[PDB]
Every structure is written in structure tokens, then in C-alpha cells.
Amino acid sequence: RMENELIVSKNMQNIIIAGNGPSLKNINYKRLPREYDVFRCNQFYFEDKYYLGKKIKAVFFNPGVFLQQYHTAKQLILKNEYEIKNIFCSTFNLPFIESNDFLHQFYNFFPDAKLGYEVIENLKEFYAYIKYNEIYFNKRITSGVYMCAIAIALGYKTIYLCGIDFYEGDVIYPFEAMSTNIKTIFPGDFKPSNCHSKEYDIEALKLLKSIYKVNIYALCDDSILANHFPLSININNNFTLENKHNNSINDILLTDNTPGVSFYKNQLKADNKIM
Amino acid sequence: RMENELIVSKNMQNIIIAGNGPSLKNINYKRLPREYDVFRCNQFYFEDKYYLGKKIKAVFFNPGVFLQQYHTAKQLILKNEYEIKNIFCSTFNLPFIESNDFLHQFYNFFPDAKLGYEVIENLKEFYAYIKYNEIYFNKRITSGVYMCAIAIALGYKTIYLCGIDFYEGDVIYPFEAMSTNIKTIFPGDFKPSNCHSKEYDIEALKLLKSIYKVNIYALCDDSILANHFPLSININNNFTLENKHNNSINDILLTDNTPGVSFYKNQLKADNKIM
Amino acid sequence: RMENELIVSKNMQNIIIAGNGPSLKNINYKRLPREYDVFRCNQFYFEDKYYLGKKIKAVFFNPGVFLQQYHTAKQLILKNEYEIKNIFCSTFNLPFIESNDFLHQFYNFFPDAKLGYEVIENLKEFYAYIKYNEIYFNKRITSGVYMCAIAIALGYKTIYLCGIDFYEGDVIYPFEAMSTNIKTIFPGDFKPSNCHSKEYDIEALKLLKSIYKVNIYALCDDSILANHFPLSININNNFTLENKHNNSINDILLTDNTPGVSFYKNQLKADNKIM
Amino acid sequence: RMENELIVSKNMQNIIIAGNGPSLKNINYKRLPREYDVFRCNQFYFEDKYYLGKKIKAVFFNPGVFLQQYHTAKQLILKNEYEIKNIFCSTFNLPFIESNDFLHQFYNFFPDAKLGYEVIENLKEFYAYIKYNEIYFNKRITSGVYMCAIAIALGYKTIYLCGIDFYEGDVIYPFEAMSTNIKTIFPGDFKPSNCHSKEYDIEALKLLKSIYKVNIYALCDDSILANHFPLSININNNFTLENKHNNSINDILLTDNTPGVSFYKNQLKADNKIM
Ligand SMILES: CC(=O)N[C@@H]1[C@@H](O)[C@@H](F)[C@@](OP(=O)(O)OC[C@H]2O[C@@H](n3ccc(N)nc3=O)[C@H](O)[C@@H]2O)(C(=O)O)O[C@H]1[C@H](O)[C@H](O)CO
Ligand SMILES: CC(=O)N[C@@H]1[C@@H](O)[C@@H](F)[C@@](OP(=O)(O)OC[C@H]2O[C@@H](n3ccc(N)nc3=O)[C@H](O)[C@@H]2O)(C(=O)O)O[C@H]1[C@H](O)[C@H](O)CO
Ligand SMILES: CC(=O)N[C@@H]1[C@@H](O)[C@@H](F)[C@@](OP(=O)(O)OC[C@H]2O[C@@H](n3ccc(N)nc3=O)[C@H](O)[C@@H]2O)(C(=O)O)O[C@H]1[C@H](O)[C@H](O)CO
Ligand SMILES: CC(=O)N[C@@H]1[C@@H](O)[C@@H](F)[C@@](OP(=O)(O)OC[C@H]2O[C@@H](n3ccc(N)nc3=O)[C@H](O)[C@@H]2O)(C(=O)O)O[C@H]1[C@H](O)[C@H](O)CO
Ligand SMILES: [Cl-]
Ligand SMILES: [Cl-]
Ligand SMILES: [Cl-]
Ligand SMILES: [Cl-]
DSSP states (O other): OOOSSOOOOTTOOEEEEEOOSGGGGGOOGGGSOSSOEEEEETTGGGOSBOTTOSEESEEEEOGGGHHHHHHHHHHHHHTTSOEEOOEEEOOOOOTTTSOHHHHHHHHHHOTTOEETHHHHTTSHHHHHHHHHHHHHHOOOOOHHHHHHHHHHHHTOOEEEEESOOTTOSSOOOSSOSSOHHHHHHSOOOOOOOTTOOHHHHHHHHHHHHHHHTOEEEEOOTTSGGGGTSOBOOOOOOOOOOOBOOTTOOOSOOOOOOOHHHHHHHHHHHHHHHHO | OOOSSOOOOTTOOEEEEEOOSGGGGGOOGGGSOSSOEEEEETTGGGOSBOTTOSEESEEEEOGGGHHHHHHHHHHHHHTTSOEEOOEEEOOOOOTTTSOHHHHHHHHHHOTTOEETHHHHTTSHHHHHHHHHHHHHHOOOOOHHHHHHHHHHHHTOOEEEEESOOTTOSSOOOSSOSSOHHHHHHSOOOOOOOTTOOHHHHHHHHHHHHHHHTOEEEEOOTTSGGGGTSOBOOOOOOOOOOOBOOTTOOOSOOOOOOOHHHHHHHHHHHHHHHHO | OOOSSOOOOTTOOEEEEEOOSGGGGGOOGGGSOSSOEEEEETTGGGOSBOTTOSEESEEEEOGGGHHHHHHHHHHHHHTTSOEEOOEEEOOOOOTTTSOHHHHHHHHHHOTTOEETHHHHTTSHHHHHHHHHHHHHHOOOOOHHHHHHHHHHHHTOOEEEEESOOTTOSSOOOSSOSSOHHHHHHSOOOOOOOTTOOHHHHHHHHHHHHHHHTOEEEEOOTTSGGGGTSOBOOOOOOOOOOOBOOTTOOOSOOOOOOOHHHHHHHHHHHHHHHHO | OOOSSOOOOTTOOEEEEEOOSGGGGGOOGGGSOSSOEEEEETTGGGOSBOTTOSEESEEEEOGGGHHHHHHHHHHHHHTTSOEEOOEEEOOOOOTTTSOHHHHHHHHHHOTTOEETHHHHTTSHHHHHHHHHHHHHHOOOOOHHHHHHHHHHHHTOOEEEEESOOTTOSSOOOSSOSSOHHHHHHSOOOOOOOTTOOHHHHHHHHHHHHHHHTOEEEEOOTTSGGGGTSOBOOOOOOOOOOOBOOTTOOOSOOOOOOOHHHHHHHHHHHHHHHHO
16 A cells, blocks of 8 residues: 555655665664655665665656566565555656656556656656656656755655665665676666766756755765765764664565566667657 | 446345356355346356346456457347346456457457446555565466456456355366367367466455455355355255257357458467467 | 537527428428528538528538538628628437548638537437447338437527438439539439438437427428328418529539648548548 | 737737748838837848847747757757747637647747738638638638738737738849758758738738738838738838847757657658658
């Protein structure tokens, strides 16, 4: 059971938004607010401990691996590894990014998931600005930034960021990113595309804050992000950091070649080749 | 004249749902409630007697033979063999099961029929669960189970099942299933696909009951089903079991090669080949 | 200027519906009611006199010659030959009759015309009955019958028919039907297809009358129709029968090969060939 | 930030509509009303001085160069050369003018732009008249006329025209129209197509005035237009005519070959070739 709609009440407008950078391991838990929902993205479940607990308000996955991630999320839920209230596909509704067939058939395959573009399109000014920069300049926001936009569109007012490290330093992930299954799905480093940049993520985040009037804090003392956004105040909060049981799902799940999966992958192949 | 909409009133929420297994011949009529509507599916009219009377609230047919079954149902009605209030196509809205063109043109060809998926999609949790199991695991519910889901979505509260025998024993149909017309339409046994299973039907039925809070009884004392669902109480009800007149329609009707039928079959061929 | 919507008021529910049979020349004008709207179809303007006056409430044209007839109607209007309040394309929304592209682009080309199927689809029982007979039996109603269905759907209550002669006798049209332009558009008799029949038109008309509870009269004393529907009562009405000026449009207009007409005819060719 | 909707209030219904003819240089500023919005089209920014000031209520661009003009307009705005409240694509929704894919994907690429046809389609009589003349007679209104129709549909009541000179005389543009970028985008005179005409523009403008009851004035004393529409009264208004800074954008901007631009141009090529 997912939520039918993600509704933010006026009484709790705090959101923690986590990337999967090394600083996920170095959160200052004293700086978390008393109440909050959590957003995670992509390979968050690769984490060896529950760095932000077991309750995820929404997870966010990219269209190119959505089939596998949707199944992985359903297994995380069934195996009681996490509680996941909503599942988004991080989308822009641009036909050189998401194929017509992918968008058309999305809800047919994933009836309880949500296309992210349907939420961020409501941020009119920000949405036009990201499309203009994508189309004409080949600049794209990362999932951390996307999740912020989604949070703002859904009516959260204070964002606390962590695991956002702009792919700098020698540790680039708090885990092995080139796991066996990642290698299989996309045959042969796992580094960001040229369309992504620290400067652009930062500009986009500053724009979200200036247009929509929300507050953005950092949580990780020793992270690059904290040089650009203020660390949240140490309010002496405590946290119980729990380990993952040993046979936790720790790699993206593969799918069996059923008639439906084969149909899906056939189509996805055909138009990923075109794009 | 079909009904425009199937509306269940609070005063009568009982539904009898019949498969076409051998136990259709062995209903304990004393266990039927006083009031009820009846759902039948597929080759129900192959029956040699009116095992559940002449008044069918809805019939349900699979997309692959819908053209012939729609015509057969219109002839059953015109020949006064049955009264049929509604006609559904048992559908899931998955493009590896029902082609885009089939779904797109459905109401164009069959303006007074109803696509079943438009009704079961409202059972959000159950609908997501059947799609997940279909796509990733190649498990599909049988029409008996589908009809239960439809009944629950339309607001029936108590289901009595019969003719559901999970394809076990040596009698598999209370009639000849490989009739001349069945053989012609689909050129050469008539046994269920590997995607269907007793275990899955049962799990899906138990899930419908636990999510939507309805009651499911059996009607056939000597049937496998009764080992999994309680027999309905013997309330001493009586039934007049009527024979079919001799020249009853007893096989699926064939269609003439008109411009419309040829157009339809041409298209259906083209994309059944793709799927 | 066409009407945006054809709205029938309770105070005037009379409609005269004219085919283009020989009996158009033999209307008994004494039998017309005091008040009425008029529907005409196809090559009505071939008439040498204004047999039903100059004011047409709606005209009805077949999809296969709609482009030329739309232009002809606009010229009839511009040249003050008739006043035409509405223009329909007599359609069923069946893809072996009207191509997907024709229906999709209809309003793009003809923004002030109306697709007839959008009106008759509201006659649920009658619409299902004509589709069933078209698809499975290759029986189609003629435009006279279609116009009756449209009238009934729009809320007219009494129909007076004329120019309906079921293609019987030696005079089949009160004019030359194989005119020069008819010959050109559709290169080489102008007789009805096998899908049309007197028996079916009559059955369909009797059905419209029994389902929707309206009255259908004849106006032509010496016509076949009057053997099946009652002649309207001689109420001593009078009529001024006016001649057409000599240079009246008397043949369907041809179109120039503009970029738009060529585009249109290219597409129409491509999928008339498929159908 | 564009406006979400262009809303005309009852208190200000005046619009200045400028073509890019030589008479843009010869506006009689004494004849402008006290209050007004301004519409400009196409290569307006080629102007060497701010002939109508810096505040544009809407700009209008043709589909065939929309990609470049949209980017040019965003740069005019970012560089503070103009303030542009709305951006329209001058469209008719005819598939031989605008491809299906162009219209389908329009808002995907340009989320804050507006398709003009969605506004002028509400002028029912005028819209049917321009489509009839386009399709059957290959007559098309120019952007000046289109902008008038848009203004009337949005509820402006008095139009003042300038820069409309029907491509007559020896000066045809108050600037070089065959600039380097114009030459590149559309490889090798810049004169109007045969579908455009002074007579038709004038007839269409007179029709807008007679159907929708608005007033149309001229502003340029020595222009052809003033022989067909009355010059606005000299009310002794004054105007500060400002020069453009030297490094003003003065040619249409070219786009970089990003994945999105290449995708877009690939598609546009494919179906401009078909049309
Ligand atoms: C190879 C490839 O495709 N790498 C991309 C990567 O360029 C980036 F597009 C992103 O991010 P991904 O690395 O998974 O990590 C999630 C988020 O954590 C933050 N982060 C992470 C590590 C780090 N050192 N500094 C950081 O700031 C970023 O804000 C990022 O959005 C993404 O969606 O933005 O997704 C991955 C994959 O497409 C994805 O993992 C498939 O499931
Ligand atoms: C060859 C083939 O395609 N067999 C399938 C069969 O695997 C099964 F998919 C089903 O069922 P079908 O056998 O017609 O019978 C209808 C229902 O009766 C119940 N039943 C029947 C016999 C039995 N011994 N034990 C039972 O439990 C099942 O719940 C079933 O759903 C179906 O839609 O579920 O449909 C048929 C045909 O596609 C259909 O007849 C075409 O018109
Ligand atoms: C060759 C061809 O295609 N003939 C068909 C004809 O079979 C018939 F389909 C019809 O009728 P069409 O003859 O024009 O005449 C209009 C109506 O007048 C009535 N009538 C006419 C003559 C007659 N002797 N007895 C009659 O009853 C019929 O009710 C008919 O519907 C039609 O749409 O029903 O349309 C024409 C053409 O497709 C059309 O003219 C193209 O513009
Ligand atoms: C080569 C080509 O395609 N020329 C066309 C031209 O035939 C005409 F279609 C138009 O007009 P364009 O010349 O740009 O000028 C804008 C408007 O100013 C008015 N005017 C201009 C000059 C003049 N001497 N007398 C005038 O009356 C007209 O009302 C016109 O609508 C148009 O959209 O109507 O657009 C251009 C281009 O397609 C456009 O510039 C691409 O960005
Ligand atoms: Cl996989
Ligand atoms: Cl058949
Ligand atoms: Cl022609
Ligand atoms: Cl370019």
C-alpha cells in the first residue's frame, strides 16, 4: 500500500533530503529537527546502516532503471527493510529524456507510482528555467535538487540536506557503486554526466529558495555543501543509528525475463537506441 | 438494451460468481441466499441446463475471443436463452496482454460493453498487487477471481462461489470444451496457461477479502474450493433447475467475413503476432 | 456563420427530412405542418426548384466527399442560394468506415462543422443496434434514416419524410446523378451499395419510433414510403414553389490543388486504399 | 517569469500592434493613446531604437523559427533589452502548416509559451473564415492581422497599427532582413509568400472589425495603411525615443547542437520535408 497522494499538513513542513554521497555517513544528528519526513533516491538501500531510519516518505528513481528499482522497492517493503510511502520516477517530460512510450505506459506498468514531472510542472517559473537550461545549454539538475523541487511543490517549507557532495574528493560514494547488478544492467566507473555540475545544482537550489521562499540547511559539518548552505543549528537532538541485518538487499534487483518484462525491455531498448 | 451502469444498492449486496468447472453441476441450492445477482464468464452457455437460472447480471469475456463472444451474447439475448444486463471484457490494461489498438477501438466496436480494467483499477491496492505479480512473476488471476474483484469494486459485499475447481481431477469441464467452433477459431487440449495457479487464485481471493472486508463462501459440497472457503449455510432454499431447449446455442458463434469483421481480425492478427 | 449548437425548443419539435429520391418532386404541400425545420443531405442542391424552400436547418454529407461538399455548402451560402444553419458529417466512428486521421483532423479542417456520431452516440440502444448490424452483418442505414436518428437525438418529436423511395422504380433521382463533377471525383451508374436495403431502413426507422417515442409521417402520396408510414393529414397548408435562378450551383464543386487540399487528398487516398 | 494568462481589464482595452515595415520608423507619437499594451512579432528586436519602448505585452513568432526565437526572447529578457510578458507561437492548428509532433510537443519544449490557435479558435466565425480561405484558396493572414485577432480574442477594444506596409515601395524593412543568422538558419531575398496579400489582410481586418465591434486606427501618416484605416487623432501625446545600446542583440540567435536541440531539429527537419 502506497499513499494515494502525498499531502503535507501546515503542522509539519520539514523534509530531510538525502543524496548518496559520502557525507551520508557523517550526518550531525544533533542538527535534525524534532519532526520531519525523509526523501531518498536511487541506490539509497546500498547503505550499510539506517543513516536516516527505516521510514521513507518518498523514494525517487530515474526512468532508465525504473523497472528494476520499482521491483527493488517492493522487495524492500515486503522484506520489512524499509517503509516507503510513495514512489516517484524523476522525470522532466522531454522526449529526448523520456520516450513517448515510457511516459504513455508508465501508469499501466506502475499504477501506484507517480511521475515527478506532474508535480514539478506546478513550479512554473522553476520548471521553465530548468527546461530552458536543459534544452539550450545541456545543463540538468541532479536528483538531490530534483527532490528539493518536488518537496517545495508539495508544500514543504524547510529542507535539510545531506549526502550531497557534488562528486568531489576521493570517496565519491559511502559504498561500492559498481556492484555486480549495476555492472550487468548497464554493461561496462560510475561518475556523473557532463550535463550535471556543482555550480548549476547550487544556482538551481538558490533559485528554488528565492522564488518559493523556503529555507535550506545543511546537516553534514565536513561536507562541501556546508560552504554554500548554512548548517542547521545544533539543537541537541539524538538519533539511534541502527545496523542493517546481514542479508539486507544491498544491490539493485534484477528482473526475470517474463512476457511483461521482455515486452518492457524490448520497447525501452528500441527507443533508448533512438535517443 | 444493456444497463448504462451496474449500480449495486445497499439493500442487495449478494453476488453468485460461477466458473465453468465440473462443480457447476453440483451446486447445493439450499445454500443460496434469498436474493442475489449472478456473474458468468466465458463459455457459460455451453451448460446443458440453467444451473443458475436465465438472468445474468453481467457476463465476462476475454479480449482474444471478445468479438465472437459479444456476438454470441447478443444472439443468446435475441433468442431469449438468457437475459444479460451487462457485458464486460476482462482486461488489465497492460500492453503485452491487450494491444493498444484493441483498447483504443474497444468502445468503437462494442459501444454498450465495458472494459473491466476501468472498474478494477479503483481497487488501488489489489490492482497494484496483480500488476506487480503479472509483470515481474508471470502470475495472473483466473476469470473467477477477476469477477470477484469486479463485484467488490462495484460494491457487492457477499460472494458465493461455484464452478471454481482449479483444473483438478479427471473431469475438467461439465461439458465438451474442445467444441467444433473452439477448435476453428484457435486451430489445434483446452488447459489453463502456466501463469494461472490454484495457490495464486486463493491468495488473491484471500487478499480481496482482507483489504475490502467482504465475505466469500462456497456453494459446492464436493469441490476443492470448499477446503479453502467455508460452505455457505444450508438455509433450505429451493431451486427450479430448468433444461435448455434442444436447439440452444451450445458453442461459441463464428462471425461472417464482413468488411468490419475482416478489418477487426486483420488488426487483431497483426498485433497478437507481435505479442 | 453556422449555429454553435443545434438547440430544439419544446415549442417547435417538427422536422422535415428529405432524401433526394424522385418523390421530392411530388410532395403534398397541404400535409406539411405549420412550423418546421428542414434537414437535407448529399446532392440536395441538384434540385431544379426549391422543393422545401431556401432555409435548411442542417445539411448532412458523407465523409468520402466531405471536403468538396463543405466547400459547395459555403458557396451555396455565399451565393445566397440557401441559408444553412449547421453542417454535419454523417459518421459512425468505426475505423473501417472513417479513418483515424479523418476523424482526428476533422475539426482542424472544418472547425464549424459537426461530426454526426457525437450526436447519435447518445441514442444508446439504437447506436449499439446499428453498430452490431454494421459490423457483424454488413447492414448500414441510409442518410435518410441517419438524419432521423440525428433529429431524435437533438429532441425533435415529429418527423415528416419525403424524397425517400428506397431506390425502386425507373426514376431513381429527380435529376441527373452522374453529373460531370460526380464522374470526375470518383472515376467510372450511381446506385446504392449492398449494405443498404429498404427492409433495414424500415426496421431501423420503426425501432427509432418504438424506443424514443416520436411520430413518423410520409408527405408523398404516390411514394413507396407511404405504404409503410402514414401520410400526414391534409391540413390545407399552402406552399410557394420557387424556381432556381439559372446559374444556380447544380453540381458538386471541385477543389483547387492548394497545399491544404493536396495534403488532405493525399492522406484520404492513402487510407481509403487501406480500407 | 512570463504571465500565466494574459488578462485584459475593462479599464484598459487599448493595444498597439506593430509590424516590422518601414513605417515603424515613422510613427506619429502624438496619436498614441494615454494607456496601452504593445504586441510585437518576429524580428522586432532588429530595430535600432526602441520605437515602441521596452515593455512588450506579448511577442509572436512563427513555428518554423520558434526554437531560435524563444531562445532570442529569453536572452532579450535576461540582458534587460526588453520586458516581455507573454510569448506566443502564431499557429492555426492545420497539419500542413504545423506538424502533429510540433503541436504535440510544444508545451514540452516551451512550457511558458502559448499556442496562438488556442486563443483565436474562440473567434468562431473569423476562425472558420480563415481556415476556409487557407485550405481552399491558399490565402493566409500575415502576423499583423494575426496579432489583431489575438488582441480581439483576449478582449482588447481599440487597435492602433503601425509597421504594417503590405510589402510595397522600395524600402521593405527599416533594417537589414537578410542578416547573417537569417541566411544561416534558412540557406539562400526575404519577401512574403504568394499566400499573403494586401487585399486579404485588409478584408480580414475589416471582418474582425465588423464581427467583433472594435476600432482599428493607423499611427503612421505616410504609410499605405492610412489609406484604408483612419489615422488616430493627434492628441498631442509625447514620446521619449531611446536608442539601443551598441551591443544590443540585433540578429536572431543561433542554438548550440545540444541533445535537446538536435532531437528537436531532427524531428522538425523530418516533417518539414513531408510538408
Ligand atoms: C553513472 C550514472 O548514471 N550516475 C548518475 C549520476 O550522474 C546522477 F545523475 C544521479 O545521482 P546518484 O549518483 O545516484 O546519487 C544521488 C544523488 O546524491 C548526490 N550525490 C551523490 C554522490 C556524490 N559524491 N555527491 C552527490 O552530490 C547527487 O545530488 C545525486 O543526485 C542522479 O540521479 O542525480 O544518478 C546516477 C545514476 O543515473 C543513478 O544512480 C541510477 O539509479
Ligand atoms: C485454453 C484457454 O485459454 N483456457 C483459458 C483458461 O486457462 C482460463 F484462463 C479461463 O477460464 P475458463 O477455463 O474459460 O473457465 C472460467 C473460469 O472457471 C474456473 N474453472 C473452470 C474449470 C475448472 N476445471 N476449474 C476452474 O476453476 C476458473 O476460475 C476460470 O476462470 C479464464 O479466463 O480464467 O479462460 C480460458 C479461455 O481463455 C476462455 O475459455 C476463452 O473464452
Ligand atoms: C453511389 C453512392 O455512393 N450512392 C450513395 C447511396 O447508396 C446512399 F448511400 C446515399 O444516398 P443518396 O443516393 O445520396 O440520397 C440521399 C438519401 O435519399 C434517399 N433516396 C434517394 C434516392 C432514392 N431513389 N431513394 C431514396 O430513398 C435515401 O434515404 C438516401 O439516404 C446515402 O448517403 O444514403 O449516398 C450516396 C452517395 O454516397 C452520396 O450521394 C455521396 O454524396
Ligand atoms: C521570408 C519570409 O518567410 N517572410 C515572412 C513574411 O512573408 C510574413 F509572413 C511574416 O512577416 P514579417 O515580414 O516578419 O513582418 C512582420 C509583419 O510586419 C508586417 N509588414 C512587414 C514589412 C512590410 N514591408 N510590410 C508589412 O506589412 C506584416 O503584417 C508582417 O506580418 C509574417 O509572419 O507575416 O513573416 C516572415 C517570416 O516568416 C518571419 O520574419 C520569420 O521570423
Ligand atoms: Cl534486469
Ligand atoms: Cl470467427
Ligand atoms: Cl475535387
Ligand atoms: Cl540555429
